[PDB]
Design a binder for these strands. Structure first.
Lengths: 30, 149, 141, 129, 82
RNA sequence: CAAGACGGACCAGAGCGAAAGCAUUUGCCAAGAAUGUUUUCAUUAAUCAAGAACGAAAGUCGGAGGUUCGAAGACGAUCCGUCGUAGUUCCGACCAUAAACGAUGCCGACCGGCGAUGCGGCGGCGUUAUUCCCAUGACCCGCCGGGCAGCUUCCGGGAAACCAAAGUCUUUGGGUUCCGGGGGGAGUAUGGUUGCAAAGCUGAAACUUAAAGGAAUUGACGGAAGGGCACCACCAGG
RNA sequence: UUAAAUCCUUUAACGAGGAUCCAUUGGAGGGCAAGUCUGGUGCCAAUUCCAGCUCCAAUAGCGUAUAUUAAAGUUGCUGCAGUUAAAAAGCUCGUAGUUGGAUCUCUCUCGGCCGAAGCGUUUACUUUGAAAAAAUU
């Protein structure tokens, strides 16, 4: 289908995106 | 799973949460202990004593009523054997299988199962040597095996 | 599954020692018998005496006839064959000359064009081939 | 056989959380398990739990809430000197803000921030983010 | 689906489960008291008894051991106890 | 009448065994899993280097027996046929190898549905044992436990075939054992060791090469096959 | 300057237009920077060899060879794999080594409230303190 390199990049990028989203959500609580 | 078999079965006894003696049991602790004494004088293993007391007299758990287990009760009076009952039954089974093997030399299945039995014997003997029930010079030997029974 | 106890250090490092031995580069670098079989003797260059000039045929899909020199190394007596950059640079080399010979370039591997030639000639008569080609220097005989 | 019941508890909770369950049963109970669950409770990750007491090792029914991404054990229980602690979180946490190394120290079972405040080290048990 | 109270199971489910796999394990057997047909005496017998149970005065077989629950002699009367 | 061999059909979606394997009746012998248990002991456990038991078939050494089949071999045809040696059968020693397969360690936890099957147990109306005079066997309904095997599934995983494990894995740690590190050289040389032998276990380097390999989707393609039509095709004729 | 010098620093005089007082080394017309180019030389327009031009990179430096490290998670503790790609032992009993369920909330004598003494079962673990060459970082 598509090489595993950009699948790994997409997964780690979306994971850091959830990290940033939950960081902003938890910062909003203060 | 089983120590030498490939079986993995769940079946066992399940004790209830109520450790209290039921109200309908009118036997006192010393009456139960006297039954234990006369049953042991009849020549019974603590397992057999527990089964008989559960079935006929209605004593569900001897430790819940008397406060001590059967082997400790027999030990305080002194009516307890030198080697424990599970090791006795294992050594008796090993003697029986070895007799069958000396009569029947082609039974390689019997050889394999005898090896299983005496390995179980070695594990239990190691445990009993570690917790001082057996003397440290005790060792299970093939000819001395029938002498223990 | 790998063991993960707090007292499994000896087992882990013994296993790693052995499985290190199962690698070609580690075994070549640690067995000693590669430098005991390398014609250069572990060196990057070596000098030699030009035994003769031979011709090696190139690969099948692109036919060519390249010209090499068979030289004998000074320090250990081994005979190797060495590549020359073009047919003009072959005229600067004579039988019974002193030559300084290096590897062909990819840390020890053969040529992807010319089959089984391993070495290239860098200097002849203690002067370089590059200077001789460009007219920067002359060579003695 | 069954060794390290804390690993079994944390794996059960993680597998329950990934299926979007609300409530999970844990057997057997332990002191270390209850302290770990209290640590996750105080940071608002696993809500509420109640210990069912039979006359054996007990059981725990835990009310999952939804914030928890991954709870995990670290086996073996590596010693964590206070310097090495920093390295540990960069190995286990996806950020330097959230996620929790849980240490058992002589001051108790706690997280890495409170262990840094109390200025002590100990054995690493897990992490949750 | 995915929404039930594990802390409070109903009697039918907790009865239906295996005796070890309940919320808190509990046995399925019981002690029951038996009147011999030839007498009046009460004998307390385990439901899953492995020994053949004789009357202490009449010596009549009350129950015979089977694979599970004990098989009472026909004529005997029994009552669930506690 | 006799000799040796072998237990078809029933015979599976079966079962048992650690595996190799296991199918005539009857008796004896000693084991065994699962189930049941308000028995007992009370951590006695898991996994394997060393060392040891068992290990299809073929094979080797002593006997016995040699019906069928049959390596070799002698003949006749031109992968087959007739005869049949060693063997195939039994007893006692060795050898310890197979596609010895799930091409897939073992122990433990968690994580969908279904209705079938084997054993044990529990509850329940009914039909049967020529309405059975109570239980018992055979069926029927449901549940529980350990199994063998399926179908299904955006649980997730995988390169894909597919997997309820080959999942709970870059969000990377339950415990522990064996083992691979590009293709050849080469299971070769050498040494050790086991074996009566055949062989078994261990096992390189020099050198050489740019690949080796796994999975899946695919147009055209001289052709090939099934049919149909036609007296500018055929049969019988003019 | 220095033992005496040289070099550097400081200063007279001379010292720049092709400021000839002239920067090299490698690579590019398949992929990371960089080509729809020219001329000789042979085989049956393609095609061996050779000289160039143009462009690109670093620059008083730039190639090459060999070893090694990093890329490399191809040695994997962090952190690999073992159906079909290299790979799980014929199978189970079969010691060592590795791992092992739940549980338990300070004082006695003698000298001025203190000092000595027994430590409290032993450790492992963690924090503190002493002590530990410079140079190197």
């Amino acid at each position: 289908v598509l090489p595993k390199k950009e699948k790994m990049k997409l997964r780690r990028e979306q994971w850091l995106q959830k990290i940033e989203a939950i960081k902003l959500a938890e910062q909003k609580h203060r | 799973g089983r120590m030498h078999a490939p079986g993995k079965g769940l079946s066992q006894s399940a004790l209830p949460y109520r450790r209290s003696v039921p109200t309908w049991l009118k036997l006192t602790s010393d009456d139960v202990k006297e039954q234990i004494y006369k049953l042991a004088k009849k020549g019974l293993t603590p397992s057999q004593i527990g089964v008989i007391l559960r079935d006929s007299h209605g004593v569900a758990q001897v430790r819940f009523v008397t406060g001590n287990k059967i082997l400790r009760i027999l030990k305080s009076k002194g009516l307890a054997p030198d080697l424990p009952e599970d090791l006795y039954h294992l050594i008796k089974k090993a003697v029986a299988v070895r007799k069958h093997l000396e009569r029947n030399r082609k039974d390689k299945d019997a050889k394999f199962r005898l090896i299983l039995i005496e390995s179980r014997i070695h594990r239990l003997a190691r445990y009993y040597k570690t917790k001082r029930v057996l003397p440290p010079n005790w060792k299970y030997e093939s000819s001395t095996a029938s002498a223990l029974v | 599954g790998k063991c993960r106890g707090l007292r499994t250090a000896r087992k882990l490092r013994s296993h790693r020692r052995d499985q290190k031995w199962h690698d070609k580069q580690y075994k070549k670098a640690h067995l000693g018998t590669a430098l005991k079989a390398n014609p250069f003797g572990g060196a990057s260059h070596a000098k030699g005496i030009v035994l003769e000039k031979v011709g090696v045929e190139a690969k099948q899909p692109n036919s060519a006839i390249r010209k090499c020199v068979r030289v004998q190394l000074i320090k250990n007596g081994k005979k190797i064959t060495a590549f020359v950059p073009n047919d003009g640079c072959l005229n600067f080399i004579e039988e019974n000359d002193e030559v300084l010979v290096a590897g062909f370039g990819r840390k020890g591997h053969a040529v992807g064009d010319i089959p089984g030639v391993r070495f290239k000639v860098v200097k002849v008569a203690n002067v370089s081939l590059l200077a001789l080609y460009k007219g920067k220097k002359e060579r003695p005989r | 056989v069954r060794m390290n019941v804390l690993a079994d508890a944390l794996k059960s909770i993680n597998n329950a959380e990934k299926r979007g369950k609300r409530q999970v049963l844990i057997r057997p109970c332990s002191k270390v398990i209850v302290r770990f669950l209290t640590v996750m409770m105080k940071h608002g990750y696993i809500g509420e739990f109640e210990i069912i007491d039979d006359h054996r090792a007990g059981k725990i029914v835990v009310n999952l809430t939804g914030r928890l991404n991954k709870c995990g054990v670290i086996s073996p229980r590596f010693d964590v000197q206070l310097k090495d602690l920093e390295k540990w979180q960069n190995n286990l946490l996806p950020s330097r803000q959230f996620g929790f190394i849980v240490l058992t120290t002589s001051a108790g079972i706690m997280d890495h921030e409170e262990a840094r405040r109390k200025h002590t080290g100990g054995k690493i048990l897990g992490f949750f983010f | 689906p995915l929404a039930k109270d594990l802390l409070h199971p109903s009697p039918e489910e907790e009865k239906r489960k295996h005796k070890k796999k309940r919320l808190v394990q509990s046995p399925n057997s019981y002690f029951m008291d038996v009147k011999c047909p030839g007498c009046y005496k009460i004998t307390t017998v385990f439901s899953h008894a492995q020994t053949v149970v004789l009357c202490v005065g009449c010596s009549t077989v009350l129950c015979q051991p089977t694979g599970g629950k004990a098989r009472l002699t026909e004529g005997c009367s029994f009552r669930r106890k506690q």
